[PDB]
Amino acid sequence: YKCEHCPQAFGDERELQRHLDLFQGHK
């Protein structure tokens, strides 16, 4: 939906999911 952090705001939870996935992707 809306991300306060990195200026991101999409109406698709996949986007955030990708953010968390990629962000959490790194050790």
| Residue 22 near Zn ion by CB under 5 A | no
Per the annotation, does 6 bind a ligand? Answer: yes
Number of residues that bind Zn ion (CB under 5 A): 4
DSSP 11: S
| Residue 5 near Zn ion by CB under 5 A | yes
Per the annotation, does 20 bind a ligand? Answer: no
Number of C-beta neighbours around residue 26 at 10 A: 5
> CA of 22: how far to CAs of 2, 5, 15, in Å?
17, 14, 10
Per CB under 5 A, residues contacting Zn ion are: 3, 5-6, 8
Binding positions for Zn(2+) are 3, 6, 19
